[PDB]
Design a protein around this motif. Structure first.
Motif, PDB file in Angstrom:
ATOM      1  N   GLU A  21      -4.401  -1.657  -3.869  1.00  0.00           N
ATOM      2  CA  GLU A  21      -3.289  -1.993  -4.737  1.00  0.00           C
ATOM      3  C   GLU A  21      -2.116  -2.513  -3.908  1.00  0.00           C
ATOM      4  OE1 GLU A  21      -4.746  -0.881  -8.731  1.00  0.00           O
ATOM      5  OE2 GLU A  21      -2.833  -1.814  -8.171  1.00  0.00           O
ATOM      6  N   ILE A  22      -1.841  -1.854  -2.774  1.00  0.00           N
ATOM      7  CA  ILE A  22      -0.711  -2.271  -1.965  1.00  0.00           C
ATOM      8  C   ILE A  22      -1.013  -3.592  -1.254  1.00  0.00           C
ATOM      9  CG2 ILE A  22       0.628  -1.602   0.078  1.00  0.00           C
ATOM     10  CD1 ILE A  22       0.346   1.326  -1.349  1.00  0.00           C
ATOM     11  N   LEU A  23      -2.230  -3.771  -0.726  1.00  0.00           N
ATOM     12  CA  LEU A  23      -2.536  -5.009  -0.011  1.00  0.00           C
ATOM     13  C   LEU A  23      -2.509  -6.233  -0.927  1.00  0.00           C
ATOM     14  CD1 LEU A  23      -5.330  -3.919   2.445  1.00  0.00           C
ATOM     15  CD2 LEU A  23      -2.805  -3.913   2.708  1.00  0.00           C
ATOM     16  N   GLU A  24      -2.979  -6.070  -2.166  1.00  0.00           N
ATOM     17  CA  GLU A  24      -2.899  -7.168  -3.109  1.00  0.00           C
ATOM     18  C   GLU A  24      -1.438  -7.604  -3.294  1.00  0.00           C
ATOM     19  OE1 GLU A  24      -4.724  -6.506  -6.975  1.00  0.00           O
ATOM     20  OE2 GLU A  24      -3.159  -5.031  -7.578  1.00  0.00           O
ATOM     21  N   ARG A  25      -0.499  -6.646  -3.305  1.00  0.00           N
ATOM     22  CA  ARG A  25       0.912  -6.938  -3.491  1.00  0.00           C
ATOM     23  C   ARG A  25       1.541  -7.540  -2.240  1.00  0.00           C
ATOM     24  NH1 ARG A  25      -0.626  -3.085  -7.087  1.00  0.00           N
ATOM     25  NH2 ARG A  25       0.688  -2.750  -8.944  1.00  0.00           N
ATOM     26  N   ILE A  26       1.138  -7.069  -1.043  1.00  0.00           N
ATOM     27  CA  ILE A  26       1.657  -7.632   0.191  1.00  0.00           C
ATOM     28  C   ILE A  26       1.208  -9.081   0.336  1.00  0.00           C
ATOM     29  CG2 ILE A  26       1.489  -7.522   2.715  1.00  0.00           C
ATOM     30  CD1 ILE A  26       1.449  -4.453   2.442  1.00  0.00           C
ATOM     31  N   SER A  27      -0.006  -9.365  -0.131  1.00  0.00           N
ATOM     32  CA  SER A  27      -0.544 -10.714  -0.079  1.00  0.00           C
ATOM     33  C   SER A  27       0.256 -11.687  -0.931  1.00  0.00           C
ATOM     34  CB  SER A  27      -1.972 -10.739  -0.483  1.00  0.00           C
ATOM     35  OG  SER A  27      -2.752 -10.076   0.490  1.00  0.00           O
ATOM     36  N   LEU A  28       1.053 -11.178  -1.897  1.00  0.00           N
ATOM     37  CA  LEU A  28       1.845 -12.033  -2.763  1.00  0.00           C
ATOM     38  C   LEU A  28       2.979 -12.666  -1.961  1.00  0.00           C
ATOM     39  CD1 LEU A  28       2.048  -9.859  -6.014  1.00  0.00           C
ATOM     40  CD2 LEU A  28       0.676 -11.918  -5.624  1.00  0.00           C
ATOM     41  N   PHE A  29       3.371 -12.052  -0.841  1.00  0.00           N
ATOM     42  CA  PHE A  29       4.356 -12.684   0.030  1.00  0.00           C
ATOM     43  C   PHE A  29       3.837 -14.039   0.514  1.00  0.00           C
ATOM     44  CE2 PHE A  29       7.922  -9.783   1.011  1.00  0.00           C
ATOM     45  CZ  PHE A  29       7.495  -8.653   0.348  1.00  0.00           C
ATOM     46  N   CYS A 297       6.338   0.058  -2.382  1.00  0.00           N
ATOM     47  CA  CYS A 297       5.776   0.159  -1.045  1.00  0.00           C
ATOM     48  C   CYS A 297       5.410  -1.214  -0.493  1.00  0.00           C
ATOM     49  CB  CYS A 297       4.579   1.093  -1.035  1.00  0.00           C
ATOM     50  SG  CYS A 297       3.823   1.202   0.601  1.00  0.00           S
ATOM     51  N   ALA A 298       4.754  -2.046  -1.303  1.00  0.00           N
ATOM     52  CA  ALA A 298       4.403  -3.385  -0.850  1.00  0.00           C
ATOM     53  C   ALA A 298       5.643  -4.236  -0.551  1.00  0.00           C
ATOM     54  CB  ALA A 298       3.481  -4.030  -1.850  1.00  0.00           C
ATOM     55  N   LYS A 299       6.669  -4.154  -1.425  1.00  0.00           N
ATOM     56  CA  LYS A 299       7.896  -4.909  -1.241  1.00  0.00           C
ATOM     57  C   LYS A 299       8.558  -4.473   0.070  1.00  0.00           C
ATOM     58  CE  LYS A 299      11.370  -7.744  -2.376  1.00  0.00           C
ATOM     59  NZ  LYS A 299      11.128  -9.056  -1.707  1.00  0.00           N
ATOM     60  N   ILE A 300       8.654  -3.152   0.319  1.00  0.00           N
ATOM     61  CA  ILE A 300       9.344  -2.681   1.516  1.00  0.00           C
ATOM     62  C   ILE A 300       8.569  -3.121   2.767  1.00  0.00           C
ATOM     63  CG2 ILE A 300      10.011  -0.643   2.822  1.00  0.00           C
ATOM     64  CD1 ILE A 300      10.530   0.643  -0.043  1.00  0.00           C
ATOM     65  N   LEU A 301       7.245  -2.982   2.755  1.00  0.00           N
ATOM     66  CA  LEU A 301       6.455  -3.302   3.938  1.00  0.00           C
ATOM     67  C   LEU A 301       6.511  -4.801   4.201  1.00  0.00           C
ATOM     68  CD1 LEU A 301       3.319  -0.981   3.579  1.00  0.00           C
ATOM     69  CD2 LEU A 301       5.219  -0.775   5.195  1.00  0.00           C
ATOM     70  N   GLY A 302       6.355  -5.620   3.144  1.00  0.00           N
ATOM     71  CA  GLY A 302       6.480  -7.060   3.303  1.00  0.00           C
ATOM     72  C   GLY A 302       7.842  -7.483   3.861  1.00  0.00           C
TER      73      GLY A 302
END
Ligand SMILES: O=P(O)(O)O[C@H]1[C@@H](OP(=O)(O)O)[C@H](OP(=O)(O)O)[C@@H](OP(=O)(O)C(F)(F)P(=O)(O)O)[C@H](OP(=O)(O)O)[C@H]1OP(=O)(O)O
Ligand SMILES: Nc1ncnc2c1ncn2[C@@H]1O[C@H](COP(=O)(O)OP(=O)(O)NP(=O)(O)O)[C@@H](O)[C@H]1O
Ligand SMILES: [Mg+2]
Ligand SMILES: [Mg+2]
Ligand SMILES: [Mg+2]
Ligand SMILES: [Mg+2]
Ligand SMILES: [Mg+2]
Length: 318
Positions: A21-29, A297-302
């Motif tokens: 779930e998180i990697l799919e969101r990080i990939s949106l960057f 989490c994805a937004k912060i990590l990205g």
């Protein structure tokens, strides 16, 4: 080119629902590409053949070759989100507690019993029926006995005579159960342990999950020290209760994140006696089954990745 974020962990973690779930969101960057290292590669290939990444998200769990991850980071020098050398220390509760104390974080009063395995009766333990003395330090029951290995979840709680004696033996949960009562009142006589004061809570643990030092999600669960029956929802998931961290607790999270150099860091708090005590630092852990957490989490990590590496890559960022 893209900034490559490499994920290096055991497949049970890399392929977990929260990770996906998180990697799919990080990939949106727009400028970030995610590469998940295959478990067969991690285990069986020399680190010189591992994929390149600019930012490495890597963490130990059971069976992970941390030595190889450390060697990879040394060879390739990526930006590391969760410090790899600190993950050796997180595997030892003695080292975890030492760091907490050095940071002025409230933790249970404790003592370490180191036992020489070739000589188990020569260590500094005296047992009475309602207490132990460890290196001279007295722990009246109830008290907690933890293996020095943080990966060993066989934590025992010893009850006072006034409560009927015996012990509660905790373990990594097996379906409906996280602990079981034992009539045994005497402490374990092989292995090394931390002994600590039992902190009286309302019967719940607070589980805290950082994403950098300025973000922490908290939730509560029934303490396994209670009766050991796991409460599960209609979907097989352990029941969680809502928590908002107070100002002191947000500061604890800040400190833990930074002290252990683990951007993504799970730890446990006991709310007792009007304060909050850290009793466990787990390192890398994602919250399960929260869409808001996955988004955050994805937004912060990205954003961390972009803030760190956008200039090198001549990419605009604020
Ligand atoms: O690595 P984490 O994701 O942190 O997962 C850690 C905990 O998470 P947390 O410490 O509670 O945040 C898992 O428990 P939950 O999914 O949280 O119930 C554990 O999940 P489980 O207790 O299996 C389960 F998914 F909750 P069930 O199958 O009982 O519903 C996971 O344990 P496993 O090893 O058995 O997968 C553990 O990992 P480890 O044992 O390596 O410490
Ligand atoms: N000093 C203490 N006083 C009271 N309860 C305690 C204490 N230490 C641990 N516990 C309880 O025992 C549980 C397990 O202890 P903990 O130190 O988190 O073990 P662990 O084996 O590292 N478990 P995990 O979170 O899965 O890594 C905690 O979640 C509390 O419910
Ligand atoms: Mg992308
Ligand atoms: Mg872990
Ligand atoms: Mg399991
Ligand atoms: Mg814990
Ligand atoms: Mg732990």
């Amino acid at each position: 080119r893209q900034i490559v974020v490499g994920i290096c962990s055991m497949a049970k973690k890399s392929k977990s629902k929260p990770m996906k779930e998180i990697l799919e969101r990080i990939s949106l960057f727009k400028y970030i590409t995610v590469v998940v290292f295959e478990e067969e590669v991690i285990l069986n290939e020399p680190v010189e053949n591992w994929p390149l990444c600019d930012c490495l998200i890597s963490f130990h769990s059971k069976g992970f070759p941390l030595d190889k991850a450390v060697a990879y980071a040394k060879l390739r020098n990526p930006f590391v989100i969760n410090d790899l050398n600190m993950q050796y220390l997180i595997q030892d509760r003695r080292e975890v507690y030492s760091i907490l104390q050095a940071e002025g974080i409230l933790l249970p009063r404790y003592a370490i019993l180191n036992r020489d395995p070739n000589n188990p009766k020569e260590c500094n333990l005296i047992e009475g029926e309602d207490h132990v003395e460890v290196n001279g330090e007295v722990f009246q029951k109830p008290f907690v006995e933890k293996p020095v290995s943080a990966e060993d979840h066989n934590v025992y709680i010893y009850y006072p005579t006034s409560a009927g004696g015996g012990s509660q033996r905790l373990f990594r949960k097996i379906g409906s159960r996280s602990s079981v009562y034992s009539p045994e009142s005497n402490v374990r006589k092989t292995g090394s342990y931390i002994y600590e004061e039992f902190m009286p809570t309302d019967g719940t643990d607070v589980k805290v999950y950082t994403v950098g030092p300025d973000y922490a999600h908290a939730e509560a669960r029934k303490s396994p020290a209670l009766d050991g029956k796991v409460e599960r929802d209609s979907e097989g998931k352990e029941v969680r209760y809502p928590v908002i961290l107070n100002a002191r607790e947000k500061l604890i999270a800040w400190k833990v994140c930074l002290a252990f150099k683990q951007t993504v860091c799970g730890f446990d708090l006991l709310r007792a006696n009007g304060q909050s005590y850290v009793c466990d630092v787990n390192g890398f852990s994602f919250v399960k089954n929260s869409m808001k957490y996955y988004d955050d989490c994805a937004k912060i990590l990205g954003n961390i990745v972009m803030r760190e590496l956008a200039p090198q890559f001549h990419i605009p960022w604020s």
